[PDB]
Each structure stands twice: as C-alpha cells, then as structure tokens.
Amino acid sequence: HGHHSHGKPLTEVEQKAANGVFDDANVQNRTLSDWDGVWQSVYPLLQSGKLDPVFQKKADADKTKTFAEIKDYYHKGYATDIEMIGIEDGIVEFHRNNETTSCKYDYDGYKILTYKSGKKGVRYLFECKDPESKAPKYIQFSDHIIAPRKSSHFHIFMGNDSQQSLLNEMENWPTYYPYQLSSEEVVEEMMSH
Ligand code: NI
Secondary structure, three states: OOOOOOOOOOOOHHHHHHHOOOHHHHHHOOOOOHHOOOEEEEEEHHOOOOOHHHHHHHHHHHOOOOHHHHHHHHHHOOOOOOOHHHHHHEEEEEEOOOOOEEEEEEEEEEEEEEEOOOOOEEEEEEOOOOOOOOOEEEEEEEEEOOOOOOOOEEEEEEOOOOHHHOOOOOOOEEEEOOOOOOOHHHHHHHHOO
C-alpha cells in the first residue's frame, strides 16, 4: 500500500450488470471518453504462455474440453496485429506493427444483446465518417458497464460492413487492458472474474 484498488466499489446493481444480469431500462448512453487512455492487446500474453493457467483451470473444470481446445479458442478470439490502441480527444488511434491509423469517431448508440443463457450484454457503437481515414468504419466496445463509467478492459469489434455484422461476430474479439498494467496484473484481473 500503495492503493491497490480502482475506483469506486460496485453497487449490487452494478455487480449484477457486470455479470450480465440487468434491466434494460437501466442501460444508458456513454461517450467515447469512457474508453480514454492507452490500451494493450492481450494476444502476446497468450502467445508467451502467461495465460496457460487460465486455460488449464478451465480444462480441469470442463470434462468435455482439453487444454489445447480451450487455448485454440482464445488464440482465435484474441488474435490481432493491433498491439496497442490510444484513445484521447475524441480520437481512436490503432497501432499495428508500429503503423498507425486513426479517426475521430461519432457515437451511434447502444445495442442490448441477449444470449441463450438468459444473460445480456451491451455494445456501444461508433462510426468513422472521415473519408481521409483508413481506420475501421464501424467499431463497438463491449465491457462490463451499462452506464457512464470509465472502462476497466474491453473487447473491441471492428469492420467495414455494418454494425449488425459486428453484433453477429463470434470468432474474433480483440481484447484490451490498460497499458500500464504488468502482465502479471493483467492475468490476475482476467482470473478475477
Ligand atoms: Ni471481463
């Protein structure tokens, strides 16, 4: 200590929401600034073998999967060449093999998704309307939050076809944690929930 936590403790309603249990009437619009900061892809952590304990734990609990099946699922899930994303002043900047593209994204609302389990998630949609940018036309953030609050980590869906295409995406879900975390810290956070 230090001060090891951040930031306000979750209310019971927020903890349920973070776990996919919420009333649609409680979902609110957010702005891009909820994702401000500098963000690291988790994919190299998978590749370095640092996430192997996450996968083994799962393989043990699940009689129907092997470690190899589980790790391959996450390999495809996290795979991206966008090692770092920077968000500031309304602009998303994607770093991809030390090459950057960026756009000042426009917000396009949220979409509430329901799963066969009964649980739900919220996607926050943005669109690039800058004809000079090479950044993806459509992006969506998915994190544990349904109302204005700074994100702890997220999936970001990206493409040039439609928002619906991203709502439907099952196989690839590039995932990002705060850049300043140690790999150990990222693994702890992944493991924590
Ligand atoms: Ni999470």
